[PDB]
Amino acid sequence: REIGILTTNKNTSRTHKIIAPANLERPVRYIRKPIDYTILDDIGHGVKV
Amino acid sequence: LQGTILQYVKTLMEVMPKICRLPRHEYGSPGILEFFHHQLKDIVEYAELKTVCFQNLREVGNAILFCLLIEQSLSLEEV
Amino acid sequence: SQQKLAEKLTILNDRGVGMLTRLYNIKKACGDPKAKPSYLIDKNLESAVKFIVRKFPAVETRNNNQQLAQLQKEKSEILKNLALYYFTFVDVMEF
Amino acid sequence: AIIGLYNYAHEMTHGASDREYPRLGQMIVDYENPLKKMMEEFVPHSKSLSDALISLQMVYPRRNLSADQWRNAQLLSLISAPSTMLNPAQSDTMPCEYLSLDA
Amino acid sequence: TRIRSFLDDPIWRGPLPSNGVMHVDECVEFHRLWSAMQFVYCIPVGTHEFTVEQCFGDGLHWAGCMIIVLLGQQRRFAVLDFCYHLLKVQKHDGKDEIIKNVPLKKMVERIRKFQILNDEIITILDKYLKVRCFQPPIHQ
SS (H, E, C) chain B: CCCHHHHHHHHHHHHCCCECCCCCHHHCHHHHHHHHHHHCHHHHCCCCHHHHHHHHHHHHHHHHHHHHHHHHHHHHHHC
**Which candidate from D1, D9, D11 shows the least CB-CB separation from C49?**
D1
Beta strands in C1-95 (DSSP E): none
| Nearest-CA distance B79 → chain E (Å) | 21
| Nearest-CA distance B30 → chain D (Å) | 19
Q: How far apart are CA B53 and CA B60, in angstroms?
A: 11
Q: E139 in contact with D at a CB cutoff of 8 Å?
A: no
Q: How far apart are CA B25 and CA B39, in angstroms?
A: 18
| Touch of E by D (3+ CB pairs closer than 8 Å) | yes
What does the DSSP assignment read for D3-67? HHHHHHHHHHHHSS--TTHHHHHHHHHHTTSHHHHHHHHTSTTHHHHHHHHHGGGGTHHHHS--H
| Nearest-CA distance B4 → chain E (Å) | 13
Q: B16 in contact with E at a CB cutoff of 8 Å?
A: yes
Interface list for chain D against chain B, based on CB atoms closer than 8 Å = 71-72, 74
Chain E adjacent subunits, 3+ CB pairs under 8 A = B, D
Closest CA to D2 of C29, C62, C66: C29
Range list of H helices, chain E: 10-13, 30-41, 52-55, 59-70, 74-79, 82-93, 104-128
Burial of D43 (0-12, 13-18, 19+ CB in 10 A): exposed
Q: E103 in contact with B at a CB cutoff of 8 Å?
A: no
Q: Phi and psi dihedrals of C25, rounded to 5?
A: -65, -40
Closest CA to B30 of E12, D86, E90, E109: E90
Residues 6-35 on D with a CB inside 8 Å of C are 6-13, 17-18, 20-21, 23-29
Q: How far apart are CA D75 and CA D68, in angstroms?
A: 11
| Nearest-CA distance A30 → chain C (Å) | 10
Closest CA to B12 of B54, B72, B67, B70: B54
| Nearest-CA distance C82 → chain D (Å) | 6
Nearest CA in chain E to B60: E63
D8/C52 CB distance under 8 A: yes
Q: How far apart are CA D64 and CA D60, in angstroms?
A: 6
**Which candidate from C2, C10, C87 shows the least CB-CB separation from A47?**
C2
Q: Rounded to an integer, what is the distance from CA A47 to the centroid of its chain? A: 34
Q: How many degrees, rounded to 5, is the angle at CA E126 between CA E124 and CA E132? A: 165
Provide Rg for chain D, Cα atoms: 26
Q: How far apart are CA E57 and CA B57, in angstroms?
A: 11
Q: Which residues of E103-112 are buried (b: 16+ CB within 10 A; e: fewer)?
A: ebeebbebbb
| Touch of C by B (3+ CB pairs closer than 8 Å) | no
Q: How far apart are CA E45 and CA E35, in angstroms?
A: 18
Question: E72 forms bridges with which residues in the sheet?
Answer: none
Single-letter amino acid code for the residue at B21: R
Q: D80 in contact with C at a CB cutoff of 8 Å?
A: no
Nearest CA in chain A to C9: A37
Closest CA to E73 of E131, E7, E2: E7
Angle between helices C5-29 and C83-94 (to 10 degrees): 150
Q: How far apart are CA E135 and CA E140, in angstroms?
A: 15
Q: E63 in contact with B at a CB cutoff of 8 Å?
A: yes
Q: Counting every residue, how long is chain D?
A: 103
Elucidation method: cryo-EM
Contact list, D85 vs chain E (CB under 8 Å): 19-22
Q: How far apart are CA B9 and CA B53, in angstroms?
A: 9
Q: How many CB atoms lie within 10 A of CB D4?
A: 22
Q: Which residues of C46-78 are buried (b: 16+ CB within 10 A; e: fewer)?
A: eebbebbeeeeeebeeeeeeebbeebeebbeeb
Q: How far apart are CA E58 and CA E116, in angstroms?
A: 13
Q: How far apart are CA B60 and CA E70, in angstroms?
A: 14
C59/D27 CB distance under 8 A: no
C7/A37 CB distance under 8 A: yes
Q: C7 in contact with A at a CB cutoff of 8 Å?
A: yes
Best E56, E66, E127 residue to mutate vs chain B (most B CBs within 10 Å): E56
**According to the 3-state scheme, what is the secondary structure of A4-47?**
HHHCCCCCCCCCCCCCCCCCCCCCCCCCCCCCCCCCCCCCCCCC
Closest CA to B40 of B18, B16, B11, B24: B16
Chain C adjacent subunits, 3+ CB pairs under 8 A = A, D
Q: How many degrees, rounded to 5, is the angle at CA E57 between CA E56 and CA E63? A: 80
Best D86, D87, D90 residue to mutate vs chain E (most E CBs within 10 Å): D86
| Nearest-CA distance E138 → chain B (Å) | 32
Provide Rg for chain C, Cα atoms: 18
| Nearest-CA distance C31 → chain D (Å) | 14
Best B19, B22, B24 residue to mutate vs chain D (most D CBs within 10 Å): B24
Exposure of D68 in the CB half-sphere (CA atoms within 13 A): 2
